[PDB]
Design an enzyme around this catalytic site. Structure first.
Site, PDB file in Angstrom:
ATOM      1  N   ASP A 190      15.550  73.888  28.572  1.00  0.00           N
ATOM      2  CA  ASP A 190      16.886  74.364  28.326  1.00  0.00           C
ATOM      3  C   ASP A 190      16.864  75.659  27.491  1.00  0.00           C
ATOM      4  O   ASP A 190      15.920  75.905  26.718  1.00  0.00           O
ATOM      5  CB  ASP A 190      17.641  73.268  27.570  1.00  0.00           C
ATOM      6  CG  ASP A 190      19.025  73.682  27.174  1.00  0.00           C
ATOM      7  OD1 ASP A 190      19.750  74.222  28.010  1.00  0.00           O
ATOM      8  OD2 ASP A 190      19.388  73.470  26.005  1.00  0.00           O
ATOM      9  N   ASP A 212      20.006  77.460  25.608  1.00  0.00           N
ATOM     10  CA  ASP A 212      20.878  77.530  24.420  1.00  0.00           C
ATOM     11  C   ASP A 212      20.766  76.241  23.629  1.00  0.00           C
ATOM     12  O   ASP A 212      20.955  75.154  24.175  1.00  0.00           O
ATOM     13  CB  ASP A 212      22.358  77.761  24.789  1.00  0.00           C
ATOM     14  CG  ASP A 212      22.615  79.114  25.501  1.00  0.00           C
ATOM     15  OD1 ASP A 212      21.668  79.896  25.757  1.00  0.00           O
ATOM     16  OD2 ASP A 212      23.794  79.386  25.835  1.00  0.00           O
ATOM     17  N   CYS A 253      22.878  77.949  36.306  1.00  0.00           N
ATOM     18  CA  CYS A 253      24.155  77.614  36.890  1.00  0.00           C
ATOM     19  C   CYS A 253      25.235  78.332  36.098  1.00  0.00           C
ATOM     20  O   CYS A 253      25.360  78.095  34.903  1.00  0.00           O
ATOM     21  CB  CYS A 253      24.387  76.121  36.889  1.00  0.00           C
ATOM     22  SG  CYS A 253      26.127  75.700  37.176  1.00  0.00           S
ATOM     23  N   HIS A 290      28.422  78.152  36.595  1.00  0.00           N
ATOM     24  CA  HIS A 290      29.700  77.604  36.979  1.00  0.00           C
ATOM     25  C   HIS A 290      30.370  76.881  35.824  1.00  0.00           C
ATOM     26  O   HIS A 290      29.731  76.538  34.820  1.00  0.00           O
ATOM     27  CB  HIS A 290      29.566  76.691  38.194  1.00  0.00           C
ATOM     28  CG  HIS A 290      29.068  77.386  39.418  1.00  0.00           C
ATOM     29  ND1 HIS A 290      27.827  77.138  39.958  1.00  0.00           N
ATOM     30  CD2 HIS A 290      29.644  78.322  40.212  1.00  0.00           C
ATOM     31  CE1 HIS A 290      27.658  77.886  41.036  1.00  0.00           C
ATOM     32  NE2 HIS A 290      28.736  78.633  41.197  1.00  0.00           N
ATOM     33  N   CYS A 337      30.426  72.296  41.086  1.00  0.00           N
ATOM     34  CA  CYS A 337      29.273  72.875  41.804  1.00  0.00           C
ATOM     35  C   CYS A 337      28.085  71.903  41.968  1.00  0.00           C
ATOM     36  O   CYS A 337      27.994  70.888  41.279  1.00  0.00           O
ATOM     37  CB  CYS A 337      28.814  74.110  41.064  1.00  0.00           C
ATOM     38  SG  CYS A 337      27.945  73.672  39.529  1.00  0.00           S
ATOM     39  N   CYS A 346      24.942  72.710  41.342  1.00  0.00           N
ATOM     40  CA  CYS A 346      23.782  73.173  40.570  1.00  0.00           C
ATOM     41  C   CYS A 346      23.830  72.927  39.047  1.00  0.00           C
ATOM     42  O   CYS A 346      22.849  73.165  38.328  1.00  0.00           O
ATOM     43  CB  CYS A 346      23.504  74.640  40.896  1.00  0.00           C
ATOM     44  SG  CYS A 346      24.952  75.732  40.948  1.00  0.00           S
TER      45      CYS A 346
HETATM   46 CA    CA Z   1      21.554  73.257  25.276  1.00  0.00          CA
HETATM   47 CL    CL Z   2      22.687  73.451  29.636  1.00  0.00          CL
HETATM   48 ZN    ZN Z   3      26.579  75.504  39.372  1.00  0.00          ZN
END
Ligand code: CA
Ligand code: CL
Ligand code: ZN
Ligand code: CA
Ligand code: CL
Ligand code: ZN
EC number: 3.1.3.15
Lengths: 163, 158
Positions: free
Chosen positions: A7, A9, A91, A93, A99, A101
């Site tokens: 991941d 953030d 992603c 979105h 979505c 994804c």
């Molecule tokens: Ca995160």
């Molecule tokens: Cl995330």
């Molecule tokens: Zn997405």
């Protein structure tokens, strides 16, 4: 082949609490020990894949160029220091978009889910949220919940290179 | 006594902007290859680190402090978060035409240190960094990204 699906953030870099968008250079801040520890993980044989939900990236709530600047610099830092992500999977979105994804959906990582694509036993999703852990479940792999105090980069580096 | 590395900033820790020599925008910030793991390797071997930099005209209309601070504070965030600590960051803000007491290779910013002289080093990409080492009475390593770079230096000094 073991993979770490990591991941962005709140995991590689800090997550801004106001809007959850690193959309300015002064909101960019690396998590402690992330570089040496990803170096250590690579040296142990792990390949790295970045996987992030970036709500509304590209649109006016989150302009691509506001994201690009700090993201590219983050990437230069990693690359220049020897940290290589095989892919950066994004992603852009909104959750309302529904979505295919958006983590914990597995669409972005579908190619790693092909039958001899990875060593599921020794591959991990590393992320700070329940949804990262759910992604791991959806992928048939281990989930590690990054936490700056209780499961941090040095601890992760140690834990995943244990023999 | 203590082993020090007096390390130049622009061109040595971070990339030197080729046209105007000032990292005054975030989009001019880049790290030199391997600088982070190698400095950590160097720290573990007992070297203490001091940053020393001429920032020509820092604070003038041509190089406003706010322009410097942004990328510099970010660079510092990156190093510190990754475990790299500089005991001090020593800056000469003057133009060469000012002929100040503090512009490298002059020794003023570093008087206080004037340490294990035999195992201490100035690391920098310019002949002025090498001259600083001579003026200080210590060793000089002429950083070059291609030919005498961070992995080489990390290896050499440990
Ligand atoms: Ca995160
Ligand atoms: Cl995330
Ligand atoms: Zn997405
Ligand atoms: Ca320089
Ligand atoms: Cl200089
Ligand atoms: Zn000066």
């Amino acid at each position: 082949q073991k993979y770490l699906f990591i991941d962005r953030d709140g995991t590689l870099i800090s997550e801004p609490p106001s809007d959850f968008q690193v959309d300015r250079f002064d909101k960019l801040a690396f998590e402690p020990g992330v570089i040496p520890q990803l170096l250590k993980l690579q040296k142990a044989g792990y390949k790295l894949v970045m996987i992030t939900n970036q709500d509304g990236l590209g649109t006016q709530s989150f302009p691509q160029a506001d994201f690009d600047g700090p993201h590219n610099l983050m990437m230069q830092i990693f690359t220049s220091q020897g940290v290589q992500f095989d892919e950066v999977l994004i992603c852009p979105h909104l959750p309302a978009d529904e979505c295919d994804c958006r983590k914990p959906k597995v669409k972005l990582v579908e190619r790693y889910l092909a039958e001899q694509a990875m060593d599921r036993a020794n591959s991990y999703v590393i992320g700070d949220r329940a949804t990262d852990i759910q992604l791991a479940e959806n992928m048939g792999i281990n989930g590690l919940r990054y936490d700056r105090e209780t499961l941090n980069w040095p601890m992760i580096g140690e834990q995943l290179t244990r023999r």
